[PDB]
Amino acid sequence: MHRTYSLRNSRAPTASQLQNPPPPPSTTKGRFFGKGGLAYSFRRSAAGAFGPELSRKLSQLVKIEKNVLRSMELTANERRDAAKQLSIWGLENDDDVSDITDKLGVLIYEVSELDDQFIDRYDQYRLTLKSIRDIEGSVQPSRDRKDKITDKIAYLKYKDPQSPKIEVLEQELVRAEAESLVAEAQLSNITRSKLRAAFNYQFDSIIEHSEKIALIAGYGKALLELLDDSPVTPGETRPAYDGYEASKQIIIDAESALNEWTLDSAQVKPT
Template identity: 75%
Template sequence: MHRTYSMRQSRAPTASQIENPPPPPSSTKGGRLFGRSNFGHAFRKGTAGAFGPDLAKKLSQLVKMEKNVMRSMELVGRERMEVAQQLSLWGEGCDEDVSDVTDKLGVLIYEIGELEDQFVDRYDQYRVTIKSIRNIEASVQPSRDRKQKITDQIAQLKYKEPNSPRIVVLEQELVRAEAESLVAEAQLSNITREKLKAAFTYQFDALREHCEKTAIIAGYGKHLLELVDDTPVTPGESRPAYDGYEASKAIIQDCEDALTNWVSGHAQVSSKLSTRARTLSQRRKNNASKRGEGVDLAGQDQPMKGDRDSWVAATEHGEIYQHGQDEDEEEEEEEAEGEHEETNGESGGGLSLMQRIGLQSKE
């Protein structure tokens, strides 16, 4: 009997993919400099923030740690697919009912591995957005350093040469530096809030879809288990002939339909605020509206560029910012050279569950 965990080829987009098109593949799915060992994890975490502006060091470490998380999730998804194939192989030598059910269970578990692979891609949207905050922090650091440098020069001159005419010049430069820093800090504050909300929206939407679809698969998996006759038999007694092939196919078809038609608007799990939480949230919203709109600094800011990595030209920040901006790109290029062959053949598209089940009839 040909097992149904066979290689996957093409699959029509699901309703959720039409509603929210999938992102490009995660940057962690390329080659790896340190292979699949934990050494790469420790190296990235240990060196994160070692270089670059002080302002961006903490967020640099967070970005690197999230990359470790994504690498781990990628490994889990790949190994889950291998487990699904092994389960189907083991069941091949069992009785007909166990063989059929384990075969279909392997299909479902393989599907969970595919979902985890898709989840990594969407999780990368969150990481990239957080990384853009890091780059903006790095761009603000030079204005802080310049203001601090001028302040130190003025203090030194007042101590050594209180009557030096250069003090007046430096004080004028300090005024300009403080104005520049004020605009930069305001823009950093605004963009940080915007990007933070966008980043975790990506993460929570991806988590919700992944968990809902995993729950759907788990539910249909339990329906498959009902096809296994676990009634004890006495020695020498034979079990009734298994007649659940069509039923197992129908369960897989229902599962595929449920996964294909799932959209966020049909999510079964919803988060409902308590009365106290709703009251406090509304009170805060009302208080914010009473305080007024405040001072709008948008007109004082430089126009934003098309990219999201900086708010002024990178050439104005010197080598230290350029190093921080290129840090991840250099690492990814090195890793791509180190393990390009390792990942060849491990990724695939998606054959529908029922197309794979169709192979069942081949003896």
């Protein structure tokens, strides 16, 4: 949607893009459907199946959100595995390198834990959407019966103008219309309420998790200053790294700001 007014689907570069040019496209693009294969697309296909034809789209969205959740669960546990592997690799290295890589590993572990909490809040969002899907599916048969009744009464009117069955189904249809009006009014109310609440909670969760992980990334950037990037000539060895206390103080302050973080202290501000 950010594409410029040209013939190319090229997004307009932001100030960050001008500051640092965008990198080349990733080489990880594999020759695959990109939906987890037929095994993971079985759920997607089953979403588009014999349903109430009304919550079909909503049920499909819910099951797609379940796929989202499964993928995020896959990238959280295996990311914390990556952090563990990074610490294991940094075990046998320079003392400053080992300390700094262990601190980066623990920061990534914090990242994975926040991802898991975001996953739980995502499941709350998905459960609210499941509730709205189920109430919509329960309210659909009312309108289905309404459509069937109006079609049958139209056919009966075609057959003759004085069948008692005609008047009886008209009398039942005036009841069905009122019940369907009430059902659709409450359906609109519940859909609006669930939609607003679920998406407000979802956006609050994502902004909280994202600003928290950004607060973590800033602390990690500050921590990365401890190691010295000055190259050392072959032969003599550089002085030993004694910044253990500084790194521990940095991680302590990061923990303190992490625990102190609250919705009131949301330094992110729109304009």
